[PDB]
Enzyme design. Sequence first.
Site, mmCIF file in Angstrom:
data_model
loop_
_atom_site.group_PDB
_atom_site.id
_atom_site.type_symbol
_atom_site.label_atom_id
_atom_site.label_comp_id
_atom_site.label_asym_id
_atom_site.label_seq_id
_atom_site.Cartn_x
_atom_site.Cartn_y
_atom_site.Cartn_z
ATOM 1 C CB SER A 1 -5.261 4.182 3.204
ATOM 2 O OG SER A 1 -6.200 4.233 2.136
ATOM 3 C CE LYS B 1 -6.608 0.789 1.039
ATOM 4 N NZ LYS B 1 -7.541 1.857 1.390
ATOM 5 C CB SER C 1 -3.283 3.201 -0.834
ATOM 6 O OG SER C 1 -3.902 3.535 0.393
ATOM 7 C CD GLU D 1 -11.058 3.174 1.646
ATOM 8 O OE1 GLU D 1 -10.050 2.943 2.336
ATOM 9 O OE2 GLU D 1 -11.369 4.320 1.282
ATOM 10 C CB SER E 1 -3.988 10.846 2.076
ATOM 11 O OG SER E 1 -4.450 10.111 0.976
#
Length: 261
Positions: free
Chosen positions: A44, A47, A104, A140, A211
């Site tokens: 993440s 992002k 997230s 994702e 993560s």
Amino acid sequence: TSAVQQKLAALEKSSGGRLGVALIDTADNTQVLYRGDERFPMCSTSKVMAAAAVLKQSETQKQLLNQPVEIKPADLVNYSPIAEKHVNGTMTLAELSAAALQYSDNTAMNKLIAQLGGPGGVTAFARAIGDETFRLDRTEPTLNTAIPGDPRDTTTPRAMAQTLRQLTLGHALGETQRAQLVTWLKGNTTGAASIRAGLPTSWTVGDKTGSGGYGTTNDIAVIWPQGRAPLVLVTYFTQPQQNAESRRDVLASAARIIAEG
């Protein structure tokens, strides 16, 4: 090897995994690097690049951040706590950016990616600001597989620190876009056990965690001490076992070593 690099190597040795660190001290452009040119899965932390790329678009599309985006049931992926609340409704691109960065939210990230024309639109923005290393290849949730040696969805600590500096302290973005990104990073809710946990509380911090598979545990931060120039710190960590558990303590400890050095 420097004193700090000896302590980071010891931390890594104690941890059983692979640690990557890049510090930029903007006072004098000095850097501390540990595995600074190795590739690490971003998870993440990518992002930030997606949100920044949409901010860059908004420099010419003045009201882009207010544009509504439909959240459809088929859009929802795991780890989307904000988007789940708006199914069969809409969120603005600003709201999706805040959700992606501060909670997230993975569905929010996919909406940013779609706004940019696919993962290649995120990589393109990195290239446009001089980052030759960042690559986003997947959406994702599959961008988080973090497979050892897989170059997809990776960057290096050296490159991500430099890019985070340009996005937050430099001029890769317009002044108001940069200020917006900085606010979003400072308001992150997922970072209390990572870099923030190893730094003096008198330092102001903005960060984005990541993560994924192989116990991958990441954090990228811009740090404002009182009475000295800001710092940029990237901490990446990944592990040999596919099912390894998160190790946010390693990122807190790397930050503590860097600050005390």
